[PDB]
Design a protein around this ligand. Structure first.
Ligand SMILES: O=C(O)CCCCCC(=O)O
Length: 194
């Protein structure tokens, strides 16, 4: 019923953060943008890289913030603000510690689950958590004190391959995601085994 107008892929900027676990969301958008032949334009006005393509008469935008992970909302709020976009027309792809590599799922609203990027977004939007989330599994290190370094590290070859499989499964349900039909999008996704 509500078309997706903005896709956001979270990550940290700089070479020392590239290809790391924390940048799964950004990688998804980066791969989604390449499949569509969309160009990511550096725009200081919105604090990140912006992309645009049409789908059913409406403009769908792609965004990778270039502020830090914890100031991401600023960028999201800057773009949603200028284009008057409702929170529920927004999909944010991100790394999810709670599921293992090779697994991806969808979710509407909810907590930020300690994720600092998600958390700034809810704040900057005026406490709107009503948006959508593509959760790309990266696995858990086993303990809470090891989390900060685990997400800021590059994964072994076997693990990346599973993530690569999951980003592929996800683009596979893009037609269903752009339309905003989440129950089918979930039904087609949630049953793919890596
Ligand atoms: O718990 C999640 O949704 C994803 C986790 C990686 C979390 C890191 C963070 O706060 O940057």
């Amino acid at each position: 019923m509500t078309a997706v107008q903005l896709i956001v892929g979270l990550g940290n900027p700089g070479p020392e953060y590239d290809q790391t676990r924390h940048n799964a969301g950004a990688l998804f958008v980066e791969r989604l943008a390449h499949a569509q032949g969309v160009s990511l334009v550096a725009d200081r006005k919105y604090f990140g890289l912006v992309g645009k393509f049409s789908h059913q008469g409406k403009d769908v935008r792609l965004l990778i913030p270039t502020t830090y992970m914890n100031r991401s909302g600023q960028s999201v709020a800057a773009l949603a603000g200028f284009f008057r976009i409702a929170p529920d027309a927004i999909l944010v792809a991100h790394d999810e510690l709670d599921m293992p590599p090779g697994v991806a799922k969808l979710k509407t609203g909810g907590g930020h689950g300690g994720h600092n990027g998600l958390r700034d977004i809810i704040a900057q939007l005026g406490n709107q958590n009503s948006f959508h989330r593509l959760r790309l599994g990266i696995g858990h290190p086993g303990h809470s004190s090891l989390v900060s370094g685990y997400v800021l590290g590059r994964a072994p070859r076997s693990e990346q391959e599973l993530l690569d499989t999951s980003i592929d499964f996800a683009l596979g349900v893009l037609p269903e995601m752009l339309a905003g039909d989440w129950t089918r999008a979930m039904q087609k996704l949630h049953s793919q085994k890596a």
